[PDB]
């Protein structure tokens with residue numbers, strides 16, 4: 530059957546405000562592991578290893594993400610941890626993975642402005658998400674030319690994302706008329722609705738960087754207040770997709786937008802097979818979306834790197850993972866010298882049944898910019914972990 534076992538770590542929020550988003554990632558990672566095990570496992574030095582896993586609950590709590598990371602690295606001695614969602618959770622974890630010279634694989638869309646030697650990324654950087662989204666909302670949406678109002682959670686991802694949006698929209702000649710943050714999990718949206726009505730009396734663009742289940746209150750409250758597509762108000766969201774939409778109800782999201790690398794509505798054999806397999810394993814009701822596709826790819830990229838390294842030692846796997854390619858559900862993906870993923874970019878409008886109608890797509894994959902080329906501190910910097918004269922951040 531198999532010669533031996535390897536145990537990997539899985540670390541995600543199964544409780545608290547982020548469980549709405551992260552719970553389905555554990556199921557997707559498990560599906561990649563079960564597919565790999567059914568195909569014969571991972572081959573190292575002529576021997577077939579079964580992939581086993583340990584799942585730790587990060588509990589929507591950043592200090593918990595750091596403590597569970599110490600446990601998986603030092604107690605369980607896993608060769609990789611698949612995990613994280615919030616940039617807060619990842620920033621709390623980063624010093625653990627760096628100080629122990631370990632390996633986190635992180636799948637979620639984020640702000641960039643980071644290039645850890647101890648982290649690989651499958652989530653969009655801003656040039657693979659928010660930069661094309663900003664341009665599409667300002668030039669092509671029904672609110673083209675109108676001002677932007679920024680709403681997000683009070684932590685590093687939304688604050689950094691919105692800094693980049695402000696520089697970009699300034700360069701396009703657009704205007705920001707509002708920027709408000711809610712504490713993560715906070716459901717009191719009424720004061721921000723009053724600010725939107727005063728700043729955008731004739732409709733416009735709302736950039737949503739809310740993370741986790743406060744999104745439920747946000748979409749329900751804005752609709753009840755008449756901040757709707759029919760009244761000329763369009764939301765572009767970066768941190769929810771088909772799974773969360775299924776929990777909230779598509780009646781609340783129809784006509785709003787998203788920007789992702791994978792969407793369940795991609796009409797390819799690879800996309801249809803991923804969605805069919807997920808539903809066959811976990812139920813007909815179950816969606817797939819970008820966060821899940823990102824998490825799925827992590828497990829297959831890791832497995833391809835191990836087989837090329839002929840080692841589970843993360844020191845060697847991290848070296849060899851740069852340049853690994855995969856025929857993913859979204860299309861072809863490639864791990865770059867900056868530890869991020871070249872990915873295809875899609876703009877979608879949410880339909881009555883909670884799918885994206887794909888309106889804009891790149892002809893092929895876009896190279897990720899870890900260091901943002903709109904933000905003044907990062908302009909002209911890159912990351913390249915393959916060259917000792919380059920590293921984390923060089924001109």
Ligand SMILES: [Ca+2]
Nearest residue numbers: 543544548552
């Ligand atoms: Ca739960």
Ligand SMILES: [Ca+2]
Nearest residue numbers: 630631843844
């Ligand atoms: Ca190590």
Ligand SMILES: [Ca+2]
Nearest residue numbers: 651652653823
């Ligand atoms: Ca991705």
Ligand SMILES: [Ca+2]
Nearest residue numbers: 758759783784
């Ligand atoms: Ca309508």
Ligand SMILES: [Ca+2]
Nearest residue numbers: 899900911912
């Ligand atoms: Ca870069």
